[PDB]
Design a protein around this ligand. Structure first.
Ligand SMILES: *[C@@H]1O[C@H](CO)[C@@H](O[C@H]2O[C@H](CO)[C@@H](O)[C@H](O)[C@H]2NC(C)=O)[C@H](O)[C@H]1NC(C)=O
Length: 361
């Protein structure tokens, strides 16, 4: 079983304990670590943060301690406009230039592969996305002729029915990618006013429009669309999503005046790192949807939808029962990498839980 763990570039800037460097990563924890977000300049892959060269290096030494650990660099991201991605993929000229620029870059820094994080291609992008992956893999196959490990090519894909239908030629890109990571944790309406859990495992028999909004359906759909189970990786969030309640109503369906307040170290509205959540729980009321099998917490006018150890173990067992390729964690930097915020002196609580389930069989 594969355990793809993303590490985000900008997590170094977090104050105090929040600050996380490749340095703090357990070399034996995951099987693949993806460095989060590289840019594209002059239609050529390029760095993002000033000290990326240094961090790329910090991260790629972990392989000295664990020969088998494989690393990948991811292009795109949320702060990377799909428009610009879209423009690179439409002109066969821009596309080829970008492609040709990757292997050298990757080789130079020590990455064993590239991860496409084109965050959501539109209906007019499907055709080109397919082109992009085909040629990419083709270039990697050619470069491997030079007598060296072939680079890996993976992609972070949306897990919403509509999104998938709109911009992905799954059956096609499936045969060219090494593995696909399902963003199975962006399910609850980033758009509207009611409390809701962003990463439900099952359907939640109470509500009936939006079933397509859960891990199960997403995975089933992908398999139906033609993606081989041995290539699917279900994404598991290591963070929670926050909401500022608009009424004393807390139960499912409650009103929302807007996103929750920022975390001391995360400093971002609506989001909370798991270690921040561990501190939040103190004086908070824990609740859990049996239907979807995920928990949520409330304190004051703050409502938090998140994943805990069992929640994540539960998803891990799911993934296993459908015989998927493995799991993908959202950031390693959002988990308790210090192990000093969530009791139990364990480091990387969440990601470990997944590993335990993934390894006990
Ligand atoms: C992202 O790539 C862009 C593309 O060049 C870099 O942002 C630049 O992008 C603008 C949009 O095309 C250019 O017009 C500007 O010349 C340029 N910005 C500056 C200040 O020079 C960008 O720097 C890359 N991202 C990062 C984080 O460096």
């Amino acid at each position: 079983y594969k355990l793809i763990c993303y590490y985000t570039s900008w997590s170094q800037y977090r104050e105090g304990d929040g600050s996380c460097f490749p340095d703090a990563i357990d070399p034996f924890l995951c099987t693949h670590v993806i460095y989060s977000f590289a840019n594209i300049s002059n239609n050529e892959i390029d760095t993002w943060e000033w000290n990326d060269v240094t961090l790329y290096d910090t991260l790629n030494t972990l392989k000295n301690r664990n020969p088998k650990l494989k690393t990948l660099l991811s292009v795109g991201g949320w702060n990377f406009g799909p428009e610009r991605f879209s423009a690179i993929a439409s002109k066969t000229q821009s596309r080829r230039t970008f492609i040709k620029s990757v292997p050298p870059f990757l080789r130079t820094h020590g990455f064993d592969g590239l991860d496409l994080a084109w965050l959501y291609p539109g209906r007019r992008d499907k055709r080109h996305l397919t082109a992009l992956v085909k040629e990419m893999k083709a270039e990697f196959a050619r470069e491997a002729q030079a007598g060296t490990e072939r680079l890996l090519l993976s992609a972070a894909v949306s897990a919403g029915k509509i999104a998938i239908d709109r911009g992905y030629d799954i059956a096609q890109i499936s045969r060219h990618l090494d593995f696909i990571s399902l963003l199975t944790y962006d399910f609850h309406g980033a758009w509207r006013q009611t409390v809701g859990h962003h990463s439900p495992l099952f359907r939640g028999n109470s509500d009936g429009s939006s079933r397509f909004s859960n891990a199960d359906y997403a995975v089933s759909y992908m398999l139906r669309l033609g993606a081989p189970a041995n290539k699917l990786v279900m994404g598991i969030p290591t963070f929670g999503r926050s909401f500022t309640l608009a009424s004393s109503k807390t139960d499912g369906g409650a009103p929302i005046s807007g996103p929750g307040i920022p975390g001391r170290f995360t400093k971002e509205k609506g989001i909370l790192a798991y270690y921040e959540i561990c501190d939040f729980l103190h004086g908070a009321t824990t609740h859990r949807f049996r239907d979807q099998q995920v928990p949520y917490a409330t304190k004051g006018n703050q409502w938090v939808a998140y994943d805990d150890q069992e929640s994540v173990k539960n998803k891990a067992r799911y993934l296993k029962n459908r015989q998927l390729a493995g799991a993908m964690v959202w950031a390693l930097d959002l988990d308790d990498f210090r192990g000093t915020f969530c009791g139990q002196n364990l480091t990387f609580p969440l990601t470990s839980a997944v590993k335990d389930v993934l390894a006990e069989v």
